Amino acid sequence: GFLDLSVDANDNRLARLTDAETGKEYTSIKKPTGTYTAWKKEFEPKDMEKYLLSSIRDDGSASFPLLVYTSDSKTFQQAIIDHIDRTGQTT
Amino acid sequence: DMESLDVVLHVVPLDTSSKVVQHLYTLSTNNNQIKMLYRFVSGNSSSEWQFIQGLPSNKNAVISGTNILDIASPGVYFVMGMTGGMPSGVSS
Amino acid sequence: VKVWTETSPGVTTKEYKQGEDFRLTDGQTIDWSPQGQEPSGGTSYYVSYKYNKRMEAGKD
Numbered sequence: 001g002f003l004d005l006s007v008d009a010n011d012n013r014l015a016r017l018t019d020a021e022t023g024k025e026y027t028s029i030k031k032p033t034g035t036y037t038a039w040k041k042e043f044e045p046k047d048m049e050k051y052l053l054s055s056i057r058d059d060g061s062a063s064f065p066l067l068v069y070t071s072d073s074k075t076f077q078q079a080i081i082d083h084i085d086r087t088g089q090t091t
Numbered sequence: 092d093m094e095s096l097d098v099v100l101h102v103v104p105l106d107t108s109s110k111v112v113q114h115l116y117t118l119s120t121n122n123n124q125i126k127m128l129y130r131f132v133s134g135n136s137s138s139e140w141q142f143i144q145g146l147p148s149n150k151n152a153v154i155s156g157t158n159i160l161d162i163a164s165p166g167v168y169f170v171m172g173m174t175g176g177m178p179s180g181v182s183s
Numbered sequence: 184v185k186v187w188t189e190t191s192p193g194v195t196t197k198e199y200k201q202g203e204d205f206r207l208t209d210g211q212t213i214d215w216s217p218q219g220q221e222p223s224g225g226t227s228y229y230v231s232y233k234y235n236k237r238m239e240a241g242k243d
Binding site: 006007008009010012 | 147148150151152153167169183
């Protein structure tokens with residue numbers, strides 16, 4: 001990718017990286033007495049999924065966030081509990 | 092287009108006495124005021140002054156004690172302790 | 184004596200292991216040609232070392 005790096009006389013830092021494959025931007029910062037943060041990716045529709053009625057597929061189509069099948073060997077009650085534990089979705 | 096400071100002008104000769112390259116350097120120990128500039132001159136005509144951006148100790152410069160909207164030189168700075176114009180809750 | 188980095192005064196984040204990592208070359212330079220780890224380019228690190236000084240009269 002392309003890295004735009006900034007570093008001050010006190011060792012504050014800003015790193016902006018854009019991926020040369022996808023064109024997605026990633027940002028990280030460091031304080032004088034700290035390490036770099038994890039890479040904050042640019043915003044995307046998938047980052048809203050915790051608040052929506054629908055999941056967002058890789059083609060950008062909508063679907064249900066919970067699908068329960070007899071192959072799963074789970075009760076509906078356990079599938080609700082597992083879904084809330086995995087996602088934090090309340091509705 | 093800068094703050095008035097004491098300067099040294101270095102004049103580089105060419106194929107004729109009517110044309111020169113000029114370098115200009117500001118005479119300050121303050122890392123925010125020390126600047127290198129250059130241009131081409133031909134008779135009464137010239138380029139504009141080409142400002143060369145230095146990195147103090149190979150780092151981005153620090154700005155403080157002013158409104159962030161009063162900064163008027165391009166480039167990348169660390170900003171802290173600004174007197175106004177910042178976004179809500181952003182200190183640096 | 185020591186080669187290292189710190190995130191606060193006196194707290195050692197990494198110490199480099201002489202022989203691997205780095206060596207003393209010509210009594211002038213830390214040399215990172217050994218196969219081990221080195222600091223990233225352009226970063227600052229600390230060295231501690233011993234040298235013989237020619238002491239000066241009226242100064243040392």
